[PDB]
Predict the structure.
Amino acid sequence: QEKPPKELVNEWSLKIRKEMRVVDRQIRDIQREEEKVKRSVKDAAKKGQKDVCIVLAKEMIRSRKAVSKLYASKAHMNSVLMGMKNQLAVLRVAGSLQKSTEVMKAMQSLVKIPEIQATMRELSKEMMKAGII
C-alpha cells in the first residue's frame, strides 16, 4: 500500500488550525461592523428617529449572536485540536490511532452549514477511516 502514516493528524491539525484563522477573521469583521452600527444607533437616537434605533438594535443583537455562534464553533475546533494532540500522545507510545467520543461530537456539532464547512464533512470522513470516528 502507500498510505500516509498517522501524520494524518498533523494534516488535520493544519486544516482545523486554518479554519480557526477563518473564524477569527469573521469575528473580527463582525466586531468591526458593530462599531459602525453603534455610531449609527447613537445619531439615530440623538435625532429622535425611534424607529431607526429600534431596527439598528435588532441588527446589533443579530451581530452579537453571530459572534456567539462563532466563538462556539472555535471552542469545538479547539476541542478537535486537543483531541489530535491526544492522538499524537496515544501514538507516541502505541503508534496507532484509536476512537474518540470527544473528537466525534465536536466534529458533529461542527459540520454545520453557514461557511465552507463542507470540508468538515470530509475531515469527518477521513477520520473514521483512520479509526477515530
